[PDB]
Design a protein around this motif. Structure first.
Motif, PDB file in Angstrom:
ATOM      1  N   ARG A  12     -78.979 -32.973  67.408  1.00  0.00           N
ATOM      2  CA  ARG A  12     -78.842 -33.693  68.634  1.00  0.00           C
ATOM      3  C   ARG A  12     -79.618 -33.045  69.775  1.00  0.00           C
ATOM      4  O   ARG A  12     -80.570 -33.652  70.258  1.00  0.00           O
ATOM      5  N   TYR A  28     -55.182 -24.781  54.684  1.00  0.00           N
ATOM      6  CA  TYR A  28     -55.517 -24.606  56.075  1.00  0.00           C
ATOM      7  C   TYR A  28     -56.973 -24.171  56.281  1.00  0.00           C
ATOM      8  O   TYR A  28     -57.905 -24.970  56.246  1.00  0.00           O
ATOM      9  N   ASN A  37     -65.540 -26.920  58.577  1.00  0.00           N
ATOM     10  CA  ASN A  37     -65.764 -27.201  59.990  1.00  0.00           C
ATOM     11  C   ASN A  37     -66.739 -26.324  60.676  1.00  0.00           C
ATOM     12  O   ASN A  37     -67.581 -26.817  61.416  1.00  0.00           O
ATOM     13  N   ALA A  93     -70.094 -27.057  59.747  1.00  0.00           N
ATOM     14  CA  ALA A  93     -70.573 -28.375  59.921  1.00  0.00           C
ATOM     15  C   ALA A  93     -71.036 -28.334  61.434  1.00  0.00           C
ATOM     16  O   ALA A  93     -72.189 -28.705  61.673  1.00  0.00           O
ATOM     17  N   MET A  94     -70.337 -27.638  62.372  1.00  0.00           N
ATOM     18  CA  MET A  94     -70.357 -27.961  63.806  1.00  0.00           C
ATOM     19  C   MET A  94     -71.686 -28.077  64.426  1.00  0.00           C
ATOM     20  O   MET A  94     -72.249 -29.163  64.636  1.00  0.00           O
ATOM     21  N   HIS A 115     -83.183 -34.033  72.486  1.00  0.00           N
ATOM     22  CA  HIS A 115     -83.281 -33.812  73.936  1.00  0.00           C
ATOM     23  C   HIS A 115     -84.422 -32.899  74.272  1.00  0.00           C
ATOM     24  O   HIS A 115     -85.163 -33.173  75.215  1.00  0.00           O
ATOM     25  N   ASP A 118     -60.577 -25.903  55.196  1.00  0.00           N
ATOM     26  CA  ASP A 118     -61.081 -26.922  55.997  1.00  0.00           C
ATOM     27  C   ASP A 118     -61.731 -26.348  57.189  1.00  0.00           C
ATOM     28  O   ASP A 118     -62.919 -26.641  57.319  1.00  0.00           O
TER      29      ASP A 118
END
Lengths: 127, 58, 127, 101, 121, 156
Positions: free
Chosen positions: B50, B32, B39, B42-43, B54, B35
């Motif tokens: 990104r 559980y 995550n 990584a987020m 901008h 991972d």
């Protein structure tokens, strides 16, 4: 129709018991429920200013409430739930949503899928 | 006589259940956690590149 | 601008739906198109807002293909000062719903006949 | 009608509003107290029942209303009234004591 | 984007917090959800400017064009790891979890079951 | 009478200057529930005001709701949280009392000004209950919330 028939009605009654029942009154369980639920539903139609939506979401979340998925929850957190839920389903169950949009009509399977999505989501919403 | 036979049939499945349950949980939970950890990191990396594009473009 | 409201035969009933993204609305006063529906309401209760989100909502549709439902929005603004409008318009700009939108503006200031006229005007344009 | 009529109305209602409130808070004060002061009593009276509790005694032969001396600032009396005439059917000897007028 | 499910995780997470981090995880769960919803929203990249209109019709084009070149040449890095040997202390914690508990417990259960035989009686 | 009715449009931020407040000796004498703006809306300005205020306005009013209760009962009966909130509400209240530069003649003080962030922050503190172990009346007639805090200290 499928969610609304009930809801409109529920709100009517809810409103009615908002209106007569408990505020400093009685405590019949039925009506108390109607209120709890109702109260819930109330928030659920309560919509921020600058918040238009896609219909399917709406039917979806509404459905949730209609089907009483939140009496077991206190009113504020519905809102939280919804946002989160919404983004969740948008993400994954965009499939399902997509479909729901497509047929324009929730379907039993979907209901379950949805249900599950919500219940679980809900489950997540709590835990 | 009869008491002990039931007492022990109880105790034994009780200790079987909890030990097999304790094992069963950990595997998937930590799977559980493993991972979620990849995550959580990584987020933000995605976001941040990104967002950079901008930010400068403005 | 003075074009008559056509006849029965030059008309047809509704079966069209129209959406606002406002749960409550689309549901509870579910509205199609043609329909005269009075919005009655008070000092930025979102009174104005209400229209805005609705318009915004149509954005998806104007981003959509519901051309048969493509809702050209006319907000005939009567009496709303230049500032009021400024905010509003601006918001619309941002939403750039404006691409599918006329805003006819007879602000607070106006010569009354203008204000008077403006809706008929808006009306003509929408007709 | 007219504003007259209305004010004529208003007048009183307003009066009422006050009156009701006078009567209210005063009542509430008394009440507040009455309750408050009720604590040792609560116990005490709860106490009273001590063994009546642990065995009631049966009388095949003592109805006694207890209300205040005024009401209609509620239907307070009406409740007991109810419950006492209702009582009275059931009963023996019906001689009654009314504490409360 | 950045994250994923691995196993069963956002729900299956929060409930279960190894004591050696246990307390931390409760707080960490809610932090994560904040990051999750935030990231999903942001734009991913903007437009990239229509030069044709601006260069022609901003006729200070000496300035504009020089700034253009600097922008078009402009290179960009990525953000920074800091916290991802946790990712690898994972495989370590995964040993602890299975073998370190798996094994000792399997031998324990071995005894509980063999004793089950007689106590059928 | 139409005119003000119209005026409402022409009003955008509204001041009812209030005797009650005044009566409380509080200069500022304004009532909050009237010191509103049609543009004061959360989506339309912001909930930092609107909610910090709602919490506050809540608290005061809620406190008002208690004020009737208390009006009968005294303080005792309440939950402590309420007691706290009362005190806080009251601190906040007091914190609104703000001296006047332009009326040293009235105040016998210099006036004050309060920088908004600091003000608000102030209320976050009181709201946070942070100072509710401090003289409540030190919130009385001050400028910065710090000066209310300061004012508390010299006392205790």
């Amino acid at each position: 129709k499928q969610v609304a028939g009930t809801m409109k009605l529920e709100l009517a009654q809810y409103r009615e018991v908002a209106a007569f029942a408990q505020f400093g009154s009685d405590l019949d369980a039925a009506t108390q429920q109607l209120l709890s639920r109702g109260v819930r539903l109330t928030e659920l139609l309560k919509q921020g200013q600058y918040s238009p939506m896609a219909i399917e979401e709406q039917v979806a979340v509404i459905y949730a409430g209609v089907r009483g998925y939140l009496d077991k929850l206190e009113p504020s957190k519905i809102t939280k739930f919804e946002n989160a839920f919404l983004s969740h389903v948008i993400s994954q169950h965009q499939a399902l949503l997509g479909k729901i949009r497509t047929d324009g009509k929730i379907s039993e399977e979907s209901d379950a899928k949805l249900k599950e999505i919500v219940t679980n989501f809900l489950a997540g919403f709590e835990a | 006589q009869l008491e002990e036979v039931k007492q022990a049939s109880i105790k034994q499945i009780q200790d079987a259940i909890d030990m097999e349950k304790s094992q069963q949980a950990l595997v998937q939970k930590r799977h559980y956690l493993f991972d979620v950890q990849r995550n959580n990191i990584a987020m933000a990396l995605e976001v941040t590149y990104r967002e950079r594009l901008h930010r400068v473009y403005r | 601008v003075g074009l008559k409201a056509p006849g029965i035969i030059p008309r047809i009933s509704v079966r069209e739906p129209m959406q606002t993204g406002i749960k409550a609305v689309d549901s509870l006063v579910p509205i199609g198109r043609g329909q005269r529906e009075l919005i009655i309401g008070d000092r930025q209760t979102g009174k104005t807002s209400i229209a805005i989100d609705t318009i915004i909502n149509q954005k998806r549709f104007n981003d959509g293909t519901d051309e048969k439902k493509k809702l050209y929005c006319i907000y005939v603004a009567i009496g709303q000062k230049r500032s009021t409008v400024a905010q509003l318009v601006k918001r619309l700009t941002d939403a750039d719903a404006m691409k599918y939108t006329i805003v006819v503006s007879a602000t607070a200031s106006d010569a009354a006949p203008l204000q008077y006229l403006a809706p008929y005007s808006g009306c003509s344009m929408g007709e | 009608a007219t504003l007259k009529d209305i004010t004529r109305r208003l007048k009183s209602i307003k009066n009422i509003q006050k009156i009701t409130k006078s009567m209210k808070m005063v009542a509430a004060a008394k009440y507040a107290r009455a309750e408050r002061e009720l604590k040792p009593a609560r116990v005490y009276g709860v106490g009273s029942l001590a063994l009546y509790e642990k065995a009631d005694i049966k009388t095949p032969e003592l109805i006694i209303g207890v209300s205040s001396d005024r009401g209609l600032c509620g239907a307070i009396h009406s409740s007991v009234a109810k419950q006492m005439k209702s009582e009275a059917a059931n009963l023996k000897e019906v001689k009654i004591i009314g504490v409360g007028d | 984007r950045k994250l994923a499910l691995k196993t069963i995780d956002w729900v299956a997470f929060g409930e279960i917090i190894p004591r050696n981090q246990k307390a931390v995880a409760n707080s960490l769960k809610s932090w994560n959800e904040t990051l999750t919803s935030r990231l999903a929203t942001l734009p991913e990249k903007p437009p990239a400017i229509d030069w044709a209109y601006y260069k022609a019709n901003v006729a200070k084009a000496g300035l504009v064009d020089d700034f253009e070149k600097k922008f078009n040449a402009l290179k960009v890095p990525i953000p920074e790891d800091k916290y991802t040997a946790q990712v690898d202390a994972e495989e370590k914690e995964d040993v602890k979890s299975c073998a370190e508990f798996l094994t000792q417990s399997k031998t324990r259960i071995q005894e509980y079951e063999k004793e089950l035989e007689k106590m059928r009686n | 009478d139409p005119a003000p009715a119209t005026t409402f449009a022409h009003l955008d931020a509204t001041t009812v200057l209030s005797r009650a407040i005044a009566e409380l000796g509080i200069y500022p004498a304004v009532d909050p529930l009237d010191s509103t703006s049609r543009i004061m809306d959360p989506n339309i300005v912001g909930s930092e005001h609107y909610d910090v205020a709602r919490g506050v306005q809540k608290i005061l009013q809620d406190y008002k709701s208690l004020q009737d209760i208390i009006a009968i009962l005294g303080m005792d009966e309440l939950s402590e949280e309420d007691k706290l909130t009362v005190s806080r509400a009251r601190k906040i209240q007091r914190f609104l009392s703000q001296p006047f530069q332009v009326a040293e003649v009235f105040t016998g003080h210099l006036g004050k000004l309060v920088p908004l962030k600091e003000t608000i922050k102030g209320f976050q503190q009181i709201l946070a209950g942070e100072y509710d172990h401090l003289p409540e009346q030190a919130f009385y007639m001050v400028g910065p919330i710090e000066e209310a805090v300061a004012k508390a200290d010299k006392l205790a």
